Ligand binder design. Structure first.
Ligand SMILES: *[C@@H]1O[C@H](CO)[C@@H](O)[C@H](O)[C@H]1NC(C)=O
Lengths: 49, 50
């Protein structure tokens, strides 16, 4: 996604992304949500179990 | 860092003569490719000359 590279499961989530926000950093400062450049959708990033 | 950033958050101020207590989060509103030298500024208001 837009140069940011990694592995995970892209599952649709209900996170309330404000229009300016793009990333989804967590408590431990871990990427957990990204916005698709083509269509504005909030996708939850989750590593494979 | 060569950027002009403006943040705004419109709030319905209640019956307080001055800036009220509480909190308000100024959301990002626009970002522009700027970098001209900045030292001073001035506001503009409409003078009553109708
Ligand atoms: C902006 O202009 C002032 C006044 O001449 C000058 O002292 C200052 O160095 C300038 N700043 C930059 C970043 O060019």
């Amino acid at each position: 996604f837009n140069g940011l590279t990694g592995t995970g499961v892209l599952t649709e989530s209900n996170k309330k992304f404000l229009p300016f926000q793009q990333f989804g950093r967590d408590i431990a400062d871990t990427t957990d949500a990204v916005r698709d450049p083509q269509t504005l959708e909030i996708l939850d990033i989750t590593p494979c179990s | 860092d060569g950027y002009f950033k403006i943040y705004s958050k419109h709030t319905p101020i209640n019956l307080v003569r001055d800036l009220p207590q509480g909190f308000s989060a100024l959301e990002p509103l626009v970002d522009l490719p700027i970098g001209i030298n900045i030292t001073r500024f001035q506001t503009l208001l409409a003078l009553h000359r109708s």
